[PDB]
A and B are shown apart, each in its own frame.
Chain A
Amino acid sequence: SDIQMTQSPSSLSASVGDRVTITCRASQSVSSAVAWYQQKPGKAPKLLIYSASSLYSGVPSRFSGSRSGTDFTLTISSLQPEDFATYYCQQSYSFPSTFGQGTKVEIKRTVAAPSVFIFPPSDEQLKSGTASVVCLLNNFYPREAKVQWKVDNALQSGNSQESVTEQDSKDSTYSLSSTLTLSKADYEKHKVYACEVTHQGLSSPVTKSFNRGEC
């Protein structure tokens, strides 16, 4: 019967000067034993709010915590560029202590189409007997973008993995990379490799591609 601490929204896109609230809800009473933490990627959590409503030190006046019954809320009164991080609620009313699962607070940007780049395997890597095709979506917004792998105009599935960056510091864009992995047997067994990118900033899906060696 641990106390659960259900936090929402899990993600949040705002621009600067926006009011932002991050609610959290205790499944039991936790009195005011509720803290708020900030975390930025690869760093430790910062204490922000203790005892449900009191600022820890070096927290500036735009932060604020409040309680109603079991409903606790962090509130940024007017969001500042420093303030785009993850936020966790924690209850310390009984053991075991539990955290909220987090709220990710992202910057709102103008829409930007990606610039697509496609990379064949290397000569080194095919001497290794396995082939990897890599496609590069670069500096787009928002995050949403579908990459489709067609081989000789045949859609692939299961044989690709993707990964995205965090919002850039300079221009708040993203980047995604997709990797199709094949047998060296299967890489040579086909002639056309295509990378299909559908995205909001594209009026029509940009698709880049290569054939064999095409030196």
Chain B
Amino acid sequence: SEVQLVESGGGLVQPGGSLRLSCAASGFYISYSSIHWVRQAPGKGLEWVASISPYSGSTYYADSVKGRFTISADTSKNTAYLQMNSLRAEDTAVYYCARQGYRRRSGRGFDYWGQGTLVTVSSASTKGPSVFPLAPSSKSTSGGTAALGCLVKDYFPEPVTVSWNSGALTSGVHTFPAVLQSSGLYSLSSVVTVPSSSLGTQTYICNVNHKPSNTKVDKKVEPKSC
């Protein structure tokens, strides 16, 4: 486990733009192995993109990227590259580099995987999320517990971090998957349940952290009454 692949260079791009992923090998020399790129669209399975083979530098490509993407390795820098040109929207995925293991130890299995970088292809633009409370109700609470939450809306692109009361209160919480909505902006809400006795005794504040727009937002959630 000194063997490690470290990816970087993803991010958000207009359609037709370009982006250059890089895979940084440490624990092995890259020139003795086949390197592979495997992308994973959000919500879907693994899709193979390209590879380069040792000693010959032969390169191979999926039909879908054949001609726009270009794989390579700088053997002096011990890293592999993927040059993506004229991106299309469905190129959006988490991109993985994988090391093909040794012929006589692991067949053609990919035995060491990257970490993924997210690449998004959108003509949308950055947008921090508007945060609104989901106020706990009249707290009739037959079961002695109420739900309170934060609606995090109209944001782009992903991800979003949501933590309640700065890391405390990791229990009962459910943060939900975001949905793409008609505007082309993502939205999700995070909710926690809690005994409704401490409703007011303890106050609850979700910590919404949206790094892609540099919004670090906190919102207090509580009811409003008469």
Return the contact of B147 from the options A90, A122, A136 (Cβ within 8 A).
A136
Residues of B within 8 A of A35 (CB): 107-110
Name the prevailing secondary structure of the A interface residues.
strand
Minimal beta-carbon separation of B134 from chain A (angstroms):
4
Return the contact of B137 from the options A32, A90, A117, A121 (Cβ within 8 A).
A117
Residues of A within 8 A of B63 (CB): 2, 96
A164 to B174, CA, bound (A): 10
A128 to B101, CA, bound (A): 55
When C-beta atoms are compared, the residue in chain A nearest to B61 turns out to be: A96
Say yes or no: B62 contacts A96, CB within 8 Å: yes
A132 to B181, CA, bound (A): 12
Does B130 sit within 8 A of A, measured CB to CB?
yes
Minimal beta-carbon separation of A33 from chain B (angstroms):
6
Say yes or no: A119 contacts B149, CB within 8 Å: yes
Interface string of B114-149 (1 = CB under 8 A from A): 111000000000000010111101100001001101
List the one stretch of B12-20, B22-30, B40-48, B78-86 in contact with chain A.
Answer: B40-48
Does A179 sit within 8 A of B, measured CB to CB?
yes
Best-buried of A39, A118, A134 by chain B (most CB within 10 Å): A134
Does B191 sit within 8 A of A, measured CB to CB?
yes
Interface string of A172-215 (1 = CB under 8 A from B): 00010101010000000000000000000000000000100011
Say yes or no: B176 contacts A175, CB within 8 Å: yes
Say yes or no: B177 contacts A165, CB within 8 Å: yes
A172 to B47, CA, bound (A): 29
Say yes or no: B130 contacts A136, CB within 8 Å: no
Across chains A and B, the number of contacting residue pairs, with CB separation under 8 Å, is 140
Residues of A within 8 A of B151 (CB): 119, 122, 125, 132, 134, 179
Does B111 sit within 8 A of A, measured CB to CB?
yes
A46 to B96, CA, bound (A): 12
A56-B109, A102-B45 given; A124·B187 CB < 8 A: no
List the one stretch of A16-24, A47-55, A71-79, A143-151 in contact with chain B.
Answer: A47-55
Does A29 sit within 8 A of B, measured CB to CB?
no
Return the contact of B109 from the options A47, A99, A161 (Cβ within 8 A).
A47
Residues of B within 8 A of A123 (CB): 224
Does A163 sit within 8 A of B, measured CB to CB?
yes
Give the number of residues in B that approach A within 8 Å (Cβ atoms): 51
Residues of B within 8 A of A128 (CB): 130
A96-139 contacts to B (CB < 8 Å)? 96-102, 115, 117-125, 128, 132, 134, 136, 138
Residues of B within 8 A of A63 (CB): none
Say yes or no: A122 contacts B225, CB within 8 Å: no
Does B60 sit within 8 A of A, measured CB to CB?
yes
Interface string of A7-43 (1 = CB under 8 A from B): 0000000000000000000000000110101010000
Minimal beta-carbon separation of A186 from chain B (angstroms):
15
A181 to B179, CA, bound (A): 13
Does B178 sit within 8 A of A, measured CB to CB?
yes
A125 to B130, CA, bound (A): 9
When C-beta atoms are compared, the residue in chain A nearest to B62 turns out to be: A96
Residues of A within 8 A of B48 (CB): 90, 96-99
Does B193 sit within 8 A of A, measured CB to CB?
yes
A45-B113, A134-B149, A215-B224 given; A179·B187 CB < 8 A: yes
Residues of A within 8 A of B225 (CB): 215
Residues of A within 8 A of B189 (CB): 134, 177, 179
Say yes or no: B176 contacts A163, CB within 8 Å: yes
A119 to B48, CA, bound (A): 43
A210 to B45, CA, bound (A): 41
- What residues make up the interface of A, taking CB atoms closer than 8 Å to B? 2, 32-33, 35, 37, 39, 44-47, 49-51, 54, 56, 86, 88, 90, 92, 95-102, 115, 117-125, 128, 132, 134, 136, 138, 161-165, 175, 177, 179, 181, 210, 214-215
